[PDB]
């Protein structure tokens, strides 16, 4: 079902702030990289076919089914 495109994701919380399934962990910010980088974790136990977060993402980084 769910699939993110880490190629086009900026790790903006506006995708994990909506659903209770999407929890976005920003691993600690270090000037090493100087960038934001984390992971998007989706759990089945909370989803729906709502698909709101597909278009809530600023980018098109989320396709769900």
């Amino acid at each position: 079902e769910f699939k993110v495109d880490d190629e086009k994701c900026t790790k903006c919380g506006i995708c994990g702030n909506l659903c209770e399934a999407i929890n976005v962990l920003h691993k600690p910010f270090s000037p090493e990289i100087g960038k934001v980088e984390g992971e998007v974790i989706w759990d089945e136990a909370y989803c729906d076919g709502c698909n709101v977060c597909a278009e809530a993402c600023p980018s098109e980084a989320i396709k769900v089914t």
């Binding site: 900026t10 000037p31 090493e32």
Partner: protein
Amino acid sequence: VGQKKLGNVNIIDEDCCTCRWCAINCPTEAITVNKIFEGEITFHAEKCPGGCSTCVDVCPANAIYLPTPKPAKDMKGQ
């Protein structure tokens, strides 16, 4: 219907230190901050006596880092 943008976000202008972590990392390039000072700072790494991360601890804009040690089979003599 188009766009959502619920709410409003600002920057407490008497607290920003012009580090630019938020402008460099903003997704939509919507933040305009300009550094108050200009110049250059250099670090002679070969003169740090190791376990003294006081500079790292006190940097306000967390510009400083301890460069992460590479794993084995990746050090490549450096």
